[PDB]
Tab-separated table of C-alpha atoms in Angstrom:
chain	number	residue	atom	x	y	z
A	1	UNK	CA	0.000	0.000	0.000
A	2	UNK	CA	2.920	2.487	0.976
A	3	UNK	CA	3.863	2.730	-2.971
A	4	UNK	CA	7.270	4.003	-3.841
A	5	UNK	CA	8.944	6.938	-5.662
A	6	UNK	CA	12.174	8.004	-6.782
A	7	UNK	CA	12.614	11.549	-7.738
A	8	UNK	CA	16.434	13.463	-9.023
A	9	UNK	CA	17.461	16.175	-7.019
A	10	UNK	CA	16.439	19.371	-8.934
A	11	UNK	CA	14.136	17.697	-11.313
A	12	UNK	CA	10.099	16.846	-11.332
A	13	UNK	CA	8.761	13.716	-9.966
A	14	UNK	CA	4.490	12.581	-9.981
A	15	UNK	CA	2.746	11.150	-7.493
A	16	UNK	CA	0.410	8.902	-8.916
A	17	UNK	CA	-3.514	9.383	-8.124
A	18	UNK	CA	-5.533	8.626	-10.964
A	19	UNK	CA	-8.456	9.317	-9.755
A	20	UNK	CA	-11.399	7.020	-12.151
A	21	UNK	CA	-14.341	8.724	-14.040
A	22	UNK	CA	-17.239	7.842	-11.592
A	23	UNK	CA	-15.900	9.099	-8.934
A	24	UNK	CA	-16.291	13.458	-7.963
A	25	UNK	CA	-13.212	15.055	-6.061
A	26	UNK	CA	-14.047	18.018	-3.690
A	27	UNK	CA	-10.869	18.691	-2.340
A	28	UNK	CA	-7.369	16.719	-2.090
A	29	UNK	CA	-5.552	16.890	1.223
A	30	UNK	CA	-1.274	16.336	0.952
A	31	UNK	CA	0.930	16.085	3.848
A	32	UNK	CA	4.335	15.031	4.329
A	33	UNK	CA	6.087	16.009	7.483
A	34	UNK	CA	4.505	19.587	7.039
A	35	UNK	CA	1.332	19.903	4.977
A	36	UNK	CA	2.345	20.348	1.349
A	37	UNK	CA	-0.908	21.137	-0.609
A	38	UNK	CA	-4.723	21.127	-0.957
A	39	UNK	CA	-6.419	20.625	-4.483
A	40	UNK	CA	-9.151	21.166	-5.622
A	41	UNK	CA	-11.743	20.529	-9.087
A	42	UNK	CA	-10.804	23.048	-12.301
A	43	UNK	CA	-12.870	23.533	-15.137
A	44	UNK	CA	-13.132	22.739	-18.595
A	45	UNK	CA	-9.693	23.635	-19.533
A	46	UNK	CA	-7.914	25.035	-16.020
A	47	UNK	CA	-6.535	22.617	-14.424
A	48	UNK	CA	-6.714	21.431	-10.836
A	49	UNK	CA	-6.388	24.281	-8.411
A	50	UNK	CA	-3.615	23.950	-6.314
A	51	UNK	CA	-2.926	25.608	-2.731
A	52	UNK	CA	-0.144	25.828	-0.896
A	53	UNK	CA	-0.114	25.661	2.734
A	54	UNK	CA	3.872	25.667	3.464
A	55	UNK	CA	6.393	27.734	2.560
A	56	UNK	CA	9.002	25.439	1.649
A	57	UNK	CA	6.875	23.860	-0.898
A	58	UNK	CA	5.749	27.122	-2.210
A	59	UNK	CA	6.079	27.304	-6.581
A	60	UNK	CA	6.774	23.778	-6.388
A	61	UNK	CA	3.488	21.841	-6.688
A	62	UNK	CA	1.368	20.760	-9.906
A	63	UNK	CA	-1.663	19.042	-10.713
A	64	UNK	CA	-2.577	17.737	-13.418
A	65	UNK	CA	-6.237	16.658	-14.790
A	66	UNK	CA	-8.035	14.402	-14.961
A	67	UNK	CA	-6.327	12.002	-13.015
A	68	UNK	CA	-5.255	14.640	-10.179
A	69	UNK	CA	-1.689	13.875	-10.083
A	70	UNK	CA	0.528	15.444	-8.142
A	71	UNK	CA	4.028	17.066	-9.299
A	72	UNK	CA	6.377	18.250	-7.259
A	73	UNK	CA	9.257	20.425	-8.834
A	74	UNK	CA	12.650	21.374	-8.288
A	75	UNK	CA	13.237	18.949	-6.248
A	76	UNK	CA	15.098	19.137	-2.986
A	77	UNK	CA	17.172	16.269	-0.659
A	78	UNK	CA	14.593	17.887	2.449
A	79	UNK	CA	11.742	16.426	-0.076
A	80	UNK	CA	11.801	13.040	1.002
A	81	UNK	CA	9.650	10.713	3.034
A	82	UNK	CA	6.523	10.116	3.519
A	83	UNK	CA	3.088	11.606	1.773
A	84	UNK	CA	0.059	11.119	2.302
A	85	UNK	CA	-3.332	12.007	0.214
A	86	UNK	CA	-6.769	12.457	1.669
A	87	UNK	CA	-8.806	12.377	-1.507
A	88	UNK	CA	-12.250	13.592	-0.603
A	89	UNK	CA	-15.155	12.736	-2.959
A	90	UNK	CA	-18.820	13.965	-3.005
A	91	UNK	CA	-19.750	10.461	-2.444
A	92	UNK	CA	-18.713	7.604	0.084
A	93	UNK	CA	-16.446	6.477	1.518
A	94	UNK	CA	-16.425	10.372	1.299
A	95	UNK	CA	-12.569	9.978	2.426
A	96	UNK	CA	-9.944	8.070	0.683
A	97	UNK	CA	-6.038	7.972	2.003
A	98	UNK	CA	-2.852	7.040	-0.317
A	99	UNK	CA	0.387	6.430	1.199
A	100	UNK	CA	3.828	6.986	-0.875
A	101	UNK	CA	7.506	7.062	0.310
A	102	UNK	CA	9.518	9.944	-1.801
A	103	UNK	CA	13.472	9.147	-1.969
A	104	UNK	CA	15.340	11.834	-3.652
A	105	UNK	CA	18.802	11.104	-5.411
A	106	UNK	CA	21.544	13.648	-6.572
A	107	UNK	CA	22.114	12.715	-10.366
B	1	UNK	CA	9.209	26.268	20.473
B	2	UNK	CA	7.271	23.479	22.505
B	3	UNK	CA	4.430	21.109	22.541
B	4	UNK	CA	1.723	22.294	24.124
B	5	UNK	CA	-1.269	20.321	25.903
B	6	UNK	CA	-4.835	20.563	26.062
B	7	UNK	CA	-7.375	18.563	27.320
B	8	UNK	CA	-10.888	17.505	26.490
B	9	UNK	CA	-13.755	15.564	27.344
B	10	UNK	CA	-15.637	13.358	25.404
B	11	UNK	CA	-18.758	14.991	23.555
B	12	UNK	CA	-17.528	17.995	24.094
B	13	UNK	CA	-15.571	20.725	23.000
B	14	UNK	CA	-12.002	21.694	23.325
B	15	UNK	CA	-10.134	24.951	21.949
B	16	UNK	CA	-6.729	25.051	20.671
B	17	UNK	CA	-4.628	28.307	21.665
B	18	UNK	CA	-3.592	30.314	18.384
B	19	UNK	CA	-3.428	33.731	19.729
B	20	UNK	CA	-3.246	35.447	16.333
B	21	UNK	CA	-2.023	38.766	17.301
B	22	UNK	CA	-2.356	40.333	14.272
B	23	UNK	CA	-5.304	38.714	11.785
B	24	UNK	CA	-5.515	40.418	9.056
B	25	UNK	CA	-2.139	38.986	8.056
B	26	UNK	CA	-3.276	35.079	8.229
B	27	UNK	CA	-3.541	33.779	4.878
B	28	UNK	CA	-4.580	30.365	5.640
B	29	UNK	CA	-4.075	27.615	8.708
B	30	UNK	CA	-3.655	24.003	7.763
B	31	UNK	CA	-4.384	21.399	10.982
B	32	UNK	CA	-2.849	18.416	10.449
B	33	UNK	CA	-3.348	15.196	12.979
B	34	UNK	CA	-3.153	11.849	12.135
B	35	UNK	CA	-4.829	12.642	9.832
B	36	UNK	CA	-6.036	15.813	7.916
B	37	UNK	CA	-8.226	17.758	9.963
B	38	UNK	CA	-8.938	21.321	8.223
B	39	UNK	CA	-8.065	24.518	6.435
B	40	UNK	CA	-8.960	28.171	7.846
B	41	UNK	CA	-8.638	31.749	5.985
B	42	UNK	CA	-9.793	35.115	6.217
B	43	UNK	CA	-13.899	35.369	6.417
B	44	UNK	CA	-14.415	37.784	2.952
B	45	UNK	CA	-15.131	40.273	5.594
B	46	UNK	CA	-15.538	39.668	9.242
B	47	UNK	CA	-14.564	38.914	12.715
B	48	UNK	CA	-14.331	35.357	11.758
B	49	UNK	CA	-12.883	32.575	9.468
B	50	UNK	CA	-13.679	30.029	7.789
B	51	UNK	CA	-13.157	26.327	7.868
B	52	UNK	CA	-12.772	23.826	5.119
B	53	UNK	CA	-12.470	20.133	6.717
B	54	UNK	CA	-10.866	18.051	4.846
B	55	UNK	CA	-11.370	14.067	6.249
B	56	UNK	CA	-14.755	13.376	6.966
B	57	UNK	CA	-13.261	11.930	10.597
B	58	UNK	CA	-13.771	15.666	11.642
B	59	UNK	CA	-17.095	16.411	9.166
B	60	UNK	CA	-19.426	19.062	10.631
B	61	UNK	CA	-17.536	19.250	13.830
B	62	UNK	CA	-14.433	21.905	12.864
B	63	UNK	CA	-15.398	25.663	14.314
B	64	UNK	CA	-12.768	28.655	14.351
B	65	UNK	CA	-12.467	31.907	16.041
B	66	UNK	CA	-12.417	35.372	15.087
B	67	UNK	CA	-10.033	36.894	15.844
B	68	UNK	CA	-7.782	34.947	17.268
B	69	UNK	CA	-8.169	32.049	14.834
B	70	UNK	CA	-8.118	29.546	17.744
B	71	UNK	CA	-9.523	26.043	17.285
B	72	UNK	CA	-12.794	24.246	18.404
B	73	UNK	CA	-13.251	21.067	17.495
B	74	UNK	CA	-16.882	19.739	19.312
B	75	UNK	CA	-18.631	16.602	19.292
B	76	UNK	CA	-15.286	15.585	20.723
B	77	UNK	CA	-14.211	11.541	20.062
B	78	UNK	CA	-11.726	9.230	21.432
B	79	UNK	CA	-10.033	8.666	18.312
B	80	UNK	CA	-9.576	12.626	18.056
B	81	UNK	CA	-6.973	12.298	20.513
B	82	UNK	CA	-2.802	12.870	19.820
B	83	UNK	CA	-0.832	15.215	17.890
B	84	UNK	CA	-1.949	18.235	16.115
B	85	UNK	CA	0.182	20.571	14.356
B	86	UNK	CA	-1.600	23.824	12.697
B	87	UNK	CA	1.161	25.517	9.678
B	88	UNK	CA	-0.410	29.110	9.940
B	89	UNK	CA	1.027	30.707	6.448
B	90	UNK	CA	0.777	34.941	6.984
B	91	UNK	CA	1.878	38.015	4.417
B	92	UNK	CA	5.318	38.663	5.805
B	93	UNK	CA	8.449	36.483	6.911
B	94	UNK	CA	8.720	33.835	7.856
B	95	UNK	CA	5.692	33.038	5.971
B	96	UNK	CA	5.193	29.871	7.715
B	97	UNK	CA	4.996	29.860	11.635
B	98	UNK	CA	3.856	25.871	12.897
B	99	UNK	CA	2.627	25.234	16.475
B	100	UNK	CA	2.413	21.853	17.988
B	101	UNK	CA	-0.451	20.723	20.051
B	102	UNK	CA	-1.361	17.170	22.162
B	103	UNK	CA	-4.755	16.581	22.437
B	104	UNK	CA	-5.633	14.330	25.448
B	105	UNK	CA	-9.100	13.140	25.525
B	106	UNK	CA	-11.286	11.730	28.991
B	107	UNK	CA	-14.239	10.099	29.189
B	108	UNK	CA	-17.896	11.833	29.408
């Protein structure tokens, strides 16, 4: 369940989400050791709002539609370790939780 | 700094210090527990903010404070007990401030 990723040191690395067609997101939740993110629905070209919630992640987070993947840029060593989405949908479960374990390298 | 503790009874409510001293520079609070817990920002205009929750663990039972931006969180539950951390982002430096809270929880 804890799915890895490996991400370069100053480069981009996605998170994957994926979220299916039935299914209606009202907001995304990401935390690490801080909280990174929240996201929420675009339009019919925007793409996934995203919102920032600390500092060190500020200009660094993506999403991307319609899956709601995360991307986290310019990546840093102080990136790594655990994430965690709380994918909350208009319908049940209503709340949803993905694990992932970030690893940064220096390439 | 440190952690600080605060205790609360089941059913209940319990508030969580902020002590904003100085609003109308908060751009937005993000709780984190266990698990996510909420979102507050400015009210458009007001005294007070408002919450988004964000795990349905804390649905319906988030409040905040104006203008302080201290915490309520009512209907209080067993499992709401542990570690909270709120990452309060404002307009000027350091742009991100975090406090660290311990929630111990009794019975009713």
């Amino acid at each position: 369940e804890i799915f890895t990723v490996n991400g370069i040191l100053g480069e981009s690395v996605t998170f994957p989400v994926n979220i299916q067609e039935p299914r209606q997101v009202k907001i995304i939740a990401w935390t690490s050791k801080t909280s990174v993110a929240y996201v929420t629905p675009g339009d019919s070209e925007t793409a996934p709002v995203v919102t920032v919630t600390h500092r060190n992640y500020y200009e660094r987070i993506h999403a991307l539609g319609p899956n709601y993947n995360l991307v986290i840029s310019d990546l840093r060593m102080e990136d790594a370790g655990d994430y965690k989405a709380d994918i909350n949908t208009q319908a049940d479960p209503y709340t949803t939780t993905k694990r992932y374990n970030l690893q940064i390298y220096r390439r």
